[PDB]
Amino acid sequence: STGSATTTPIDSLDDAYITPVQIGTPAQTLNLDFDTGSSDLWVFSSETTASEVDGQTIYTPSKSTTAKLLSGATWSISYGDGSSSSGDVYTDTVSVGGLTVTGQAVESAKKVSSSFTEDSTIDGLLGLAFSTLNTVSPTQQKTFFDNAKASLDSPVFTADLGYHAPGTYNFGFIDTTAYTGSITYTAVSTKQGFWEWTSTGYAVGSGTFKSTSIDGIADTGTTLLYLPATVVSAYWAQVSGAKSSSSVGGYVFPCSATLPSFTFGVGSARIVIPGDYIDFGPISTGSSSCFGGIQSSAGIGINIFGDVALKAAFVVFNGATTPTLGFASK
Numbered sequence: 405s406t407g408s409a410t411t412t413p414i415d416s417l418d419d420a421y422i423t424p425v426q427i428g429t430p431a432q433t434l435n436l437d438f439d440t441g442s443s444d445l446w447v448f449s450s451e452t453t454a455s456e457v458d459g460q461t462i463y464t465p466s467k468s469t470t471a472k473l474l475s476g477a478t479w480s481i482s483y484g485d486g487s488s489s490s491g492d493v494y495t496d497t498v499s500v501g502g503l504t505v506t507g508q509a510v511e512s513a514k515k516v517s518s519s520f521t522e523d524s525t526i527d528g529l530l531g532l533a534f535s536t537l538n539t540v541s542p543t544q545q546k547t548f549f550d551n552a553k554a555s556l557d558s559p560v561f562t563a564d565l566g567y568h569a570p571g572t573y574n575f576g577f578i579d580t581t582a583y584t585g586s587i588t589y590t591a592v593s594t595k596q597g598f599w600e601w602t603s604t605g606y607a608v609g610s611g612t613f614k615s616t617s618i619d620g621i622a623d624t625g626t627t628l629l630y631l632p633a634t635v636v637s638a639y640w641a642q643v644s645g646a647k648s649s650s651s652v653g654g655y656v657f658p659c660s661a662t663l664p665s666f667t668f669g670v671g672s673a674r675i676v677i678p679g680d681y682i683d684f685g686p687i688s689t690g691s692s693s694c695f696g697g698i699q700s701s702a703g704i705g706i707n708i709f710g711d712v713a714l715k716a717a718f719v720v721f722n723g724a725t726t727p728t729l730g731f732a733s734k
Contacts, residue, residue: 406503406556407552409424411438416685418566418627420523420526420625422525427447427510428463428469428471428496429470429497432463432464432467432468434447437528437529437625438530439530439623440533440563441708443547444511444538444539445548447463447511447513448460448462449463449464451512452513452514456515456520458521458524465510473492474509477543478490478540480539481539483625487516487517487518487519489520490514490515491511492512493545494512495507498510500530500575503575503576508548509546511545530548531547531548532549532624534550552576555576558576558578559723560577560721560723561573562579562718563719564582564719571715582718582734584732585732587718588671588732590670590731592729598621601621601729603617603669603709604672607666608666609642609665613667618631618635619706619707622714622721627710628708629677629682629697629712630700631699632707639698643657646658652687654699655700659686660692662679665678665679668713673731683696684697718732
């Protein structure tokens with residue numbers, strides 16, 4: 405089998421992407437944030453504290469003839485931005501782009517933190533990291549991809565995120581019309597539960613490539629590109645007036661600037677992030693200070709190849725017995 409679904413930016417900055425997902429019988433369609441950095445499929449629901457729902461579409465398990473309470477199971481998750489959610493668990497039928505999994509764990513939120521409530525466009529998350537990170541207790545549950553894998557034509561999914569435009573998540577096949585050149589594959593460590601890999605270096609604008617190993621994760625659920633302080637300083641030093649602001653929480657730059665590109669290495673191959681992809685707009689409405697799309701990882705503990713990086717590429721998440729990642733230009 406295969407599936408193919410369009411993913412759409414939630415706003416004019418590409419802060420995140422939503423993909424429609426059918427849950428239950430009859431289908432209830434929710435728009436979920438596909439997140440290769442986590443491993444829980446959780447939804448706003450009829451169980452979510454009413455004051456914490458503000459415009460999201462909810463899953464109502466009592467209206468699904470295929471929903472079953474997973475007795476005793478609870479979940480609770482916290483994300484790198486400090487947001488969080490928790491609740492109980494149902495199994496139900498879940499379909500993405502025509503690919504159907506029966507018995508998928510659908511984690512129903514009883515509580516969500518303020519940032520989720522405040523984002524009316526995201527009805528939940530669909531995790532695509534390794535199932536060892538799933539938070540369901542006392543019986544850990546599998547991701548949608550892990551459950552679908554055996555049925556897929558090939559044990560892969562691909563992320564083709566757009567810049568200020570829709571893109572595509574495909575399951576079970578590699579669309580050879582969706583990228584240019586060849587796909588360069590690179591080794592993955594699953595030891596931390598992430599799609600963790602090592603970039604071979606970077607360049608800033610038209611500058612020379614610096615060969616240096618950068619371990620990090622391919623994370624569709626993180627907006628920005630978080631890299632070591634040395635690399636980020638080298639980038640922003642090429643932008644007149646750019647500075648790190650403790651009050652804002654990162655590097656800012658004059659909105660009048662034209663930003664240089666940023667290149668990252670994948671083996672001997674190179675992915676170029678255009679300068680425009682690094683502009684996240686005014687720090688507050690009407691400001692002439694703009695927020696940068698490349699930020700230091702120094703306070704995180706891991707480097708994160710988030711959407712800023714991934715949307716410059718066609719990305720293969722290869723879930724073969726030994727997983728690997730593939731990157732192509734597009």
